[model samples]
Target: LLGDFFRKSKEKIGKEFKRIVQRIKDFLRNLVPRTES
Candidate 1:
């Protein structure tokens, strides 16, 4: 049961990280002007 809990927690963390990263990317895109260099 403990191992199962840990596995589920890890998966949840992974999902949270992805969401955070996407939010950061969205914020940066809006804050910084895009350049076509």
Candidate 2:
């Protein structure tokens, strides 16, 4: 029971971090171009 709050917070932070990761993918996509033919 005591770990419930911490678990919920972890999920919330994980989701937020994932969102940042997704945006970073887009950011990198624009700046980094294809290297090969």
Best by lDDT: 1
For model 2, how does the per-residue alpha-carbon lDDT over 1-37 read when each residue is reduced to its tens digit?
Answer: 6599888888998899999999998997788688457
How accurate locally, in lDDT, is each candidate?
0.90, 0.87
Each candidate's TM vs. the true structure? 0.52, 0.52
Count of clashing pairs, candidate 2: 0
Q: Measured by TM-score, how close is model 2 to the native structure?
A: 0.52
Q: Where is model 2 more than 4 Å wrong at Cα?
A: 1-5, 33-37
Reference-based lDDT, residue 27, model 2: 93
lDDT of 1 by residue, 1-37 (tens): 9999999998998899999999999897788687556
lDDT of 1: 0.90
Number of residue pairs clashing in candidate 1, backbone atoms closer than 3 angstroms, sequence gap of 3 or more or interchain: 0
